[model samples]
Target: RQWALEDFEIGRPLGKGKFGNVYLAREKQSKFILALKVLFKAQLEKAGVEHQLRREVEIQSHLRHPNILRLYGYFHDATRVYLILEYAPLGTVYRELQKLSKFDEQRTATYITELANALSYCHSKRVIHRDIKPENLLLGSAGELKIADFGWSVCGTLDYLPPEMIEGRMHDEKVDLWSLGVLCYEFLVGKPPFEANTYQETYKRISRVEFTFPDFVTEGARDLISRLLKHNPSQRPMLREVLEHPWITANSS
Candidate 1:
């Protein structure tokens, strides 16, 4: 059924997003509290993002991982689709970062270890979450990391994307790892490693791929980031290696 904004009560705050709004809604007769993402078909059509919308459903529906957001069901109507998703009350990791001025090394290690485990699971399933930014990573109320937003994700054949999706030329699991590195840097530094006002500038920096660690960064952290940010994906360390790196392994609390 196509639900209107009026169908939901105000002050029951759902998530506000660039694409659309999500609501914590309860079905009239069920005790289940659903995270309902309602997208406007007209808006998607206007933005020429219909394909992306379809891809989101296709990719998310097929994925089943404890660390990934769960899709319960989808409600399709003539004008819109309501994506029923698992609710994560703690919101996104991006917002969590803002709550802490910066994450200490131990906390950073713990979070990245959990994320690497999730990514390893994804790569094993032949899935690549193209966008792995902090904003797309949510924390469950229990504080587990749950990856959200499969809008830019895909299954198998990561090499199939057209050049210029982000940087250029080729793509693979390293793309998500690269975003992970970017997320790590952002978590520590309070901003993206590449600071440019425009996508054009951002892509340019991404292509050249230059990042520097501040003097305050521990040698261990620098070592990990260096391996992650390598311009050549082949040269970048694998998730297995990253998980076992001293920075992470030695930081066990």
Candidate 2:
């Protein structure tokens, strides 16, 4: 059945995103809880983000995975478009990371395990999530990790960016693997591998594939990181290899 605004008793505002505002909602009939992402057509026309929204909507709505937030469907009125979405009781990973400062090996390993599988699913669908940062990830009520915000993103966020993005060359799905490695590095070290005080040095290191792991990071973990963070894109292992990596297996299973 098509949803109407009145059928949903809108509740509190969730948060604001670049394209729209999110709020809580529940269906009066089914008593189902969900989030409504409301985007203003006027604002969209003003900012010219229609393509991004279309891609985000199409990519997310079609994807069905445990680790990817579900986009149920959408409806719109004269002035606004309402996107029906799954709700997360907790919040973004960035929120928790700030509180804990950094995650230990157990947590990071489990996280990497989930992320690798989720990304493997994404890659299987031929969808490349170029942006795989903490801020773009969410935590479920059970503290399970979920990837959110499919904006068809590219670099310029810097920290999780790969060398190919910095080199301004054609890249493929393997870009996510590099970002995944950077994310793994950040999980343990609390900062990205190539991050420096200045853009020049950061770009230099990113281009040269220069970064070091802390002494505390285990050899198994280091091996996976080194394999994923290769300067040559093809040299990086596939998502299957990542799942089989000893670091992920030793901790996760």
Candidate 3:
């Protein structure tokens, strides 16, 4: 079922997305605020993602980590599925970056530590969050950071998804780490390491490991990014190694 943007009440706001809208809603029973992700089956069918809905539900339900968004429950109506979720008042980290322009080394280190801890937990559970961009990371009002959205997450693999996924290769966890590397680069430099104007060009750049670094980026940061972005997913750092990276261990608060 389609939800009109007007369906939300005052003090409730909708988070933007291409597939669905997540609303900050208040429960009538407990007067508690929660995030409600409403997905229209028709839209899912149109995107050929109807099958992924079950996968998303399974993944979100089983994941339990302080850094991961909590899924309370789910329900379905005639036209839509409602996922009750934890609300992050601070919203996406992307918005925070837009406001700050760039983060200082200390701040970046703190946030990175939180992310590493979260990723480590997920990895331990055999789950790999394929997309780790800033937009998928949210902060609570108390400054706690959590990973959101499991629509692209899965289990196994180092976190680097090979180019085959576009053609039919099974996507794995390493894809998440690859994106994490991209995210780290953006965090430090304000842009992705392998950016291009077109999707084809972006894929080429990623496949080729095309990247450059300026003097402003610390040597430690560069080293970590290098390990994380290894073209050979086998060589990419695992969660244990990432947590032990000089950048992480040295800078973490």
Using lDDT as the measure, the top candidate is: 2
Model 3 over residues 172-239: C-alpha lDDT tens digits?
66766666677777778877787677776676776777889978998888888887787766677777
Reference-based lDDT, each prediction: 0.73, 0.84, 0.74
Residue-level lDDT tens digits of model 1 in 1-253: 3444344443355687655788887665455676888787778878888898788887887888777898776766677767877888888887888898688787778778778888888899888887777777888777878888877776322121222355446576777667777767777776677767666656566667756777788888888877777777777778889888898778734
- Over the stretch 6-101, how does candidate 2's per-residue lDDT look in tens digits? 778899998887657999999899899998888888887687777777888889988988788888888888888888889988887788798888
Could you tell me which residue pairs clash in candidate 2? Answer: none
Off by over 4 Å in 2: 153-156, 197-200
lDDT of 1 at 162: 21
When 2 and 3 are scored with TM-score, the better candidate is 2
TM-score of each model, paired residue for residue:
0.87, 0.90, 0.88
lDDT computed for candidate 3: 0.74
